Amino acid sequence: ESQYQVGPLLGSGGFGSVYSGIRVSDNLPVAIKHVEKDRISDWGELPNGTRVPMEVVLLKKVSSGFSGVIRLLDWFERPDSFVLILERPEPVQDLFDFITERGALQEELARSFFWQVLEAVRHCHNCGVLHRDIKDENILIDLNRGELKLIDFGSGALLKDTVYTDFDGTRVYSPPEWIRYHRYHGRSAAVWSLGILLYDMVCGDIPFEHDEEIIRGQVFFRQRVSSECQHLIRWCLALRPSDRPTFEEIQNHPWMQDVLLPQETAEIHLH
Ligand SMILES: N[C@H]1CC[C@@H](Nc2cc(Br)cc3cc(C(=O)O)oc23)CC1
């Protein structure tokens, strides 16, 4: 309020409305995210019983210097909303916009980005948090450093080992067991969404637009993609959840070897 100067609206949607801002005391770039109270489905509580959006609990759980996940810096409660103060890299572009501009990504570039999204998702899971909405719109690229950041935990849940029977993330990234049965386990649903995301990077758009396509699980490549990259995508998109790879198996897959460092990725591909 007196602590932040507000700049342009960066976007709005099912997550609420996000503005660019600056922390007045030190000029730190921030993002200022507004979530309407009557739009929040899950609430948690802090160690002290303040009731808050679950999004705030999940953000505090993943909060750290590890730069692959967005950092929550502060939050405020207002009569009808919460306001979240988040990190803002500068210059930044989300991966959906990057793919709009560049089209299908060279595999070396997809490999570096996909590897970093894997390290980020693993960090979420180590911290007890299941994101449930991994997709290009929820990934920011720090263009100077070549570092990716997972954002928007507003569809997320505490990670558990039993079945989830609710879901409010993005349907075209959701797995066939959710479409058919309204049931999924967190990790294998996450790896399916990562299959979708990797196809999106290397082909320039997602493979499935319809329920019928998700449930059939047949994958057609409309761009030239190496056999190793196609094998990994088709493995992540296995119809049976226990036939999907673990994160360890994805990162040990032959297509993932020799990944660029984030700085090298910015030097070779982003400038
Ligand atoms: N897909 C778009 C990305 C740019 C903008 N959101 C956006 C920009 C910036 Br910088 C940081 C964050 C953190 C979060 C969040 O946790 O939801 O959203 C953010 C609008 C929506």
From Swiss-Prot:
GO biological process: apoptotic process; cellular detoxification; cellular response to type II interferon; negative regulation of apoptotic process; negative regulation of DNA-binding transcription factor activity; negative regulation of innate immune response; positive regulation of brown fat cell differentiation; positive regulation of cardiac muscle cell proliferation
Catalytic activity: L-seryl-[protein] + ATP = O-phospho-L-seryl-[protein] + ADP + H(+); L-threonyl-[protein] + ATP = O-phospho-L-threonyl-[protein] + ADP + H(+)
Matches recorded under Pfam families: Pkinase
Cellular component GO terms, alphabetical: cytoplasm; cytosol; nucleolus; nucleoplasm; nucleus; plasma membrane
Recorded GO MF terms: ATP binding; manganese ion binding; protein serine kinase activity; protein serine/threonine kinase activator activity; protein serine/threonine kinase activity; ribosomal small subunit binding; transcription factor binding
This protein's UniProt keywords: Apoptosis, ATP-binding, Cell cycle, Cell membrane, Cytoplasm, Host-virus interaction, Kinase, Magnesium, Membrane, Metal-binding, Nucleotide-binding, Nucleus, Phosphoprotein, Proto-oncogene, Serine/threonine-protein kinase, Transferase, Ubl conjugation
EC number(s) given by UniProt: 2.7.11.1
Source taxon at top rank: Eukaryota
Record-annotated active site: D133 (proton acceptor)
Post-translational modification: Autophosphorylated on both serine/threonine and tyrosine residues. Phosphorylated. Interaction with PPP2CA promotes dephosphorylation.
Residue stretches making up the Protein kinase domain: 4-256
PTM-bearing positions, type Phosphoserine: S64, S227
UniProt: ATP binding residues: L10, G11, S12, G13, G14, F15, G16, S17, V18, K33, E87, D94
Induction remark: By interferon-gamma (IFNG). Strongly induced in leukocytes by the JAK/STAT pathway in response to cytokines. Induced by different cellular stresses, heat shock and cytotoxic agents.
Result, substituting L159F: Decreased kinase activity
Cofactors named for this entry: Mg(2+)
Expression across tissues: Expressed primarily in cells of the hematopoietic and germline lineages. Isoform 1 and isoform 2 are both expressed in prostate cancer cell lines.
Oligomer and partners: Interacts with RP9. Interacts with HSP90AA1, this interaction stabilizes PIM1 protein levels. Interacts (ubiquitinated form) with HSP70 and promotes its proteasomal degradation. (Microbial infection) Interacts with Epstein-Barr virus EBNA6; this interaction upregulates and stabilizes PIM1 and induces cell proliferation by inhibiting the growth suppressive properties of p21.
Family per record: Belongs to the protein kinase superfamily. CAMK Ser/Thr protein kinase family. PIM subfamily.
Function summary: Proto-oncogene with serine/threonine kinase activity involved in cell survival and cell proliferation and thus providing a selective advantage in tumorigenesis. Exerts its oncogenic activity through: the regulation of MYC transcriptional activity, the regulation of cell cycle progression and by phosphorylation and inhibition of proapoptotic proteins (BAD, MAP3K5, FOXO3). Phosphorylation of MYC leads to an increase of MYC protein stability and thereby an increase of transcriptional activity.
Official protein name in the record: Serine/threonine-protein kinase pim-1
Record organism: Homo sapiens (Human)
Gene: PIM1
